[PDB]
């Protein structure tokens, strides 16, 4: 069995708060907390892959360089995050006597706290209210709606935002300077367009393209990763001249092996997030796509159901 090279996702994982590129105000605030020391309870939320847990880990490393292995607790959904284990472990950690530097506090990191049970969060509320001058919590969830209201009340909400293409380009050029590779600007633009703000997706696509071909060119990138289905579905829905939408479907979704359920769900999401057309036409289109979704889920999954959904959408578009 051959050995495996470390993936570029964590082979170039940042270790300093200056390495991560993104929301400049957020990173400056994190650096200020790093220099000062008095870290408040924070709830970091945002889209996947935009550098949430890496910032928390870098901040904890900078704050507890010498006592990271002793005064930092890391829990996630992979651990038994239930009321008994949360109670016992968090209360044992929050009362443990560890002589940190005067500005440094214990940090309890809870990755992906969105999937955490309500009673465990209720216990965490009381634990945070008791032990706050010795330990400081730190959540990192994709959506902050799952976390109960009192936990957000006693924390400091800090939301991330999707990275602009400039920051993804800067990081990609930094990694390309770190490891030698031949690239074309068209290939990098294609990778950035495919990533859609997801830095981890960009790194995975770049690594896959380099391993598959060795040259980061537009054709190689489009061979490794296909065009995203939301874009082709949006092109299908927005286009008039029903025959054109029918052939777009039959060419780019049916013969490319996309399941009918996936096409219908993607159409629902696209027409929900669509902004070019007015509200009433979006509502009708959602109604028709939902009727087709009901038909598909009942079991009648064929090309003709999708064609009929497109036909009803186009009859709506031409205003009968």
């Amino acid at each position: 069995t051959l050995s495996l090279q470390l993936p570029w996702v964590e082979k170039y994982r940042p270790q300093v708060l200056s390495d991560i590129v993104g929301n400049k105000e957020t990173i400056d605030r994190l650096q200020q907390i790093a220099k000062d020391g008095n870290m408040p309870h924070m709830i970091i939320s945002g889209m996947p892959g935009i550098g949430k847990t890496t910032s928390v880990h870098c901040l904890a490393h900078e704050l507890l360089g010498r006592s990271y292995a002793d005064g930092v607790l890391e829990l996630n959904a992979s651990d038994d995050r239930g009321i008994d284990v949360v109670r016992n472990q968090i209360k044992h950690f929050a009362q443990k006597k560890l002589h940190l530097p005067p500005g440094k506090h214990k940090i309890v990191i809870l990755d992906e706290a969105d999937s955490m049970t309500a009673g465990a969060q209720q216990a965490l509320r009381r634990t945070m209210e008791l032990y706050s001058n010795s330990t400081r919590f730190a959540f990192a969830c994709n959506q902050s709606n799952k976390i109960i209201e009192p936990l957000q009340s006693r924390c400091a909400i800090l939301r991330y935002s999707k990275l602009s293409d400039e920051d993804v380009l800067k990081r990609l050029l930094q990694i390309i300077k770190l490891e030698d590779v031949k690239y074309t600007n068209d290939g990098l633009e294609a990778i950035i367009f495919t990533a859609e703000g997801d830095m981890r997706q960009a790194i995975n696509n770049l690594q896959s393209t380099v391993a598959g071909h060795g040259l980061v060119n537009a054709d190689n990138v489009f061979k490794i990763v296909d065009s995203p289905h939301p874009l082709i579905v949006k092109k299908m829905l927005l286009a008039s001249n029903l025959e054109d939408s029918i052939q777009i479907l039959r060419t780019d979704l049916w013969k490319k092996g996309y399941s009918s359920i996936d096409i219908v769900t993607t159409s629902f999401r696209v027409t929900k997030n669509l902004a070019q057309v007015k509200e009433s036409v979006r509502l009708e289109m959602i109604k028709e796509i939902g009727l087709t979704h009901m038909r598909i889920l009942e079991g009648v999954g064929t090309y003709l159901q999708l064609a009929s959904m497109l036909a009803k959408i186009h009859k709506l578009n031409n205003k009968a």
Partner: protein, 257 residues
């Protein structure tokens, strides 16, 4: 070669002492001074005050450099204390400003050594200055007999109405299912004095106690053959178990009258 080298000569004694009040309280502060080890704990319901004191004579070699607070969880201490043998000699060790303590379980055979580190929990508990007062009655009976009687009565009601009148202890209990009563007579046993009942009468008493609290108190009945209970009308009961060089006295507050 550290601050504290308190060395028990027989570890199961310390295991019994810790298990004596394991369930009632979890966090306990251990004050370690030159005279001995004194510990005070407060129950979560603030009704039980488990005062403890171990003299220097109990330890085979007790050497405390200067007074210090040792706050440790009883759950972790009981988990660690299940790692030794009857011949094992506990050699509790603490360093300067301790964050962890080494419970070195030595053995008579020198090829078997087991050291366990225990992380100290920061506990904020105000010290209670108890005072010596005369109680209306002092009852001393064997711990096994007392435990038997109280476990008999606790299977009937959640409350016990201890009564001492006319040199007649009147352990009674009334509940929804029924009513129970036990009457004992103080006497002296020539064959085995530790099986006798001794009582002194100063004032009558009217005291009431719960069930689970008394069960937690008698959980530590293994340390002493006989328990010394002192009753006062307007003062907490003092359930005292005499050790070889110390005691484990419980302060349980009687209910409303």
């Amino acid at each position: 070669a550290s601050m504290l080298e308190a060395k028990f000569e027989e570890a199961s004694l310390f295991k019994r002492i810790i298990d004596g009040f394991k369930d009632c309280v979890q966090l306990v502060n251990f004050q370690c001074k030159e005279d001995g080890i004194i510990a005070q704990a407060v129950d979560d319901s603030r009704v039980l005050l488990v005062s403890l004191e171990i003299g220097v004579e109990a330890f085979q070699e007790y050497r405390c450099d200067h007074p210090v607070t040792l706050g440790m969880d009883l759950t972790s201490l009981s988990k660690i204390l299940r790692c030794g043998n009857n011949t094992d000699t506990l050699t509790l060790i603490a360093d300067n400003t301790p964050d962890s303590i080494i419970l070195l379980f030595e053995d008579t055979k020198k090829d078997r050594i087991a050291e366990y580190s225990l992380k100290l929990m920061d506990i904020d508990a105000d010290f209670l200055k108890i005072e010596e007062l005369q109680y209306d009655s002092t009852l001393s009976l064997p711990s096994s007999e007392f435990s038997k009687i109280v476990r008999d009565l606790s299977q009937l009601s959640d409350s016990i109405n201890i009564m001492i009148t006319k040199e007649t202890i009147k352990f009674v209990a009334d509940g929804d299912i029924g009513s129970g009563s036990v009457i004992i007579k103080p006497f002296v046993d020539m064959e085995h004095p530790e099986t006798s009942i001794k009582l002194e009468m100063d004032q009558p008493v009217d005291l009431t106690f719960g069930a689970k609290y008394l069960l937690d108190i008698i959980k530590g009945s293994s340390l002493s053959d006989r328990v010394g209970i002192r009753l006062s009308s307007e003062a907490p009961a003092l359930f005292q178990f005499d050790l070889k060089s110390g005691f484990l006295q419980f302060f349980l507050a009687p209910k409303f009258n």
